[PDB]
Design an enzyme around this catalytic site. Sequence first.
Site, PDB file in Angstrom:
ATOM      1  N   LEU A  53       4.551   6.497  -2.588  1.00  0.00           N
ATOM      2  CA  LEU A  53       5.788   6.124  -3.320  1.00  0.00           C
ATOM      3  C   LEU A  53       5.499   5.363  -4.534  1.00  0.00           C
ATOM      4  N   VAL A  54       4.226   5.006  -4.913  1.00  0.00           N
ATOM      5  CA  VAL A  54       4.059   3.834  -5.958  1.00  0.00           C
ATOM      6  C   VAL A  54       3.130   4.657  -6.912  1.00  0.00           C
TER       7      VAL A  54
ATOM      8  N   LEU B  95       0.831  -1.192  -0.012  1.00  0.00           N
ATOM      9  CA  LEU B  95      -0.074   0.071   0.194  1.00  0.00           C
ATOM     10  C   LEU B  95       0.844   1.169   0.025  1.00  0.00           C
ATOM     11  N   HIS B  96       2.090   1.257  -0.474  1.00  0.00           N
ATOM     12  CA  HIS B  96       2.912   2.525  -0.520  1.00  0.00           C
ATOM     13  C   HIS B  96       2.594   3.071  -1.915  1.00  0.00           C
ATOM     14  N   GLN B  97       1.183   3.618  -2.031  1.00  0.00           N
ATOM     15  CA  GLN B  97       0.974   4.475  -3.251  1.00  0.00           C
ATOM     16  C   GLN B  97       1.601   5.835  -3.212  1.00  0.00           C
TER      17      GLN B  97
END
EC number: 3.1.-.-
Lengths: 293, 187
Positions: free
Chosen positions: B32-33, B28-30
């Site tokens: 950084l994604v 869930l590193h949106q």
Amino acid sequence: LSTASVLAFERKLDPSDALMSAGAWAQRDASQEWPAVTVREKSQTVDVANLPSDADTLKVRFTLRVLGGAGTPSACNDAAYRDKLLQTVATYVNDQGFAELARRYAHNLANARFLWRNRVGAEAVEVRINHIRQGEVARAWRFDALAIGLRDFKADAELDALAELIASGLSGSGHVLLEVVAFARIGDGQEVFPSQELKTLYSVRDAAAIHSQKIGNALRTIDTWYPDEDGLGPIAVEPYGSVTSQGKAYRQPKQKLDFYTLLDNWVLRDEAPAVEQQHYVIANLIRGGVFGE
Amino acid sequence: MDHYLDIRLRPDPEFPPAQLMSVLFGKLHQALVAQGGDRIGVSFPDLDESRSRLGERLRIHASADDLRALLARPWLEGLRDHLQFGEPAVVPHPTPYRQVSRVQAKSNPERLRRRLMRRHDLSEEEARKRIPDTVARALDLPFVTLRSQSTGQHFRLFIRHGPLQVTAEEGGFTCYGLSKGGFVPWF
């Protein structure tokens, strides 16, 4: 004098299954006929549920029928235990109505907990609620689900008018039938979360859906009357109140707050709990189930 | 490093360890994604490898402006009602060795490894002899799950971080941007 060996309680606040359908946001005017959401595959063979990519809004629709008459068991061996159980609820209802219960029931329709994994991650969720005395809508509603707090319960004159309707149904004042419609912006072609079959997905007219009892689990998170701690939010009203995801229980039988221990005090032993604890006792009679020995 | 942050996910049914709150811990590193942002230091402040979870809060190591006002991506949603929320603060004034977060440390190479075993113009009878399965071996990577197209529930993860420095500075950038080698907050 003692509990009967058979205690079957017909449940109240009976939900249905929830059809899912896509559609564009701000198309809520002509939002009746949508294409639904199917269950396709991707490859190792799994079953995923996604929107059509042109749409951004999940539409969830079920119905709810408030029955009422919460005191009478459907099956009971002894009549003296049956009569005093009806005397004990008649003590409760005359002292206070179903309003404080139903105002906590009036939240769970507004801030859409029945969007279980769909509300978390959304950005705009609107719930329509309609009262249908006939095929026509006799009373309509309109509620934001994100402004109304998921973890904290607050009152509103729109909610309290809706709370008196569900209080009128549970007290047996009349017929209450509800049409809950939930629009939720999730995004273009995103993964909605239907209910997980034991692995396919629960679809009905080849349209992915949620179980009826998985909605009714979301409509009864009212028990903030813990033994331990109210800091984690509300939890579904169950005897031996326990959460599978947290893993631990609450309300141990070693504690004197057990629903069976409360009911033996509040009916047989004539030992009244707190008024805040009385709401937990009634909200399992709306749940129903096989009780007694 | 310069401004270390935290994100508290409150306890509830929907955030238990099964698939509503298991898979939102290493996938869930949106921010950084997908939601916007690529130059932060991944430093989870709950690196406890006993439960196989290298982060408890939403620990992120950023700069002063990146923690105060430059960290408003969509990688911090869900904590508005289904959890609590955090804010930015100062970086580690003491020497904290918090050079460990969600980074590109993981051992799932068996998802596509037939080209390294038997897709080199040979048959399929060399998927473990020419190129073995030793990289496609799940291990005790302490890290929350991921919710991609690998299962309907959550998945596995790992911590692609190492030691941390003593000064205040964002370290190196891995796949997850795990700020290893930089003196991030220790916890």
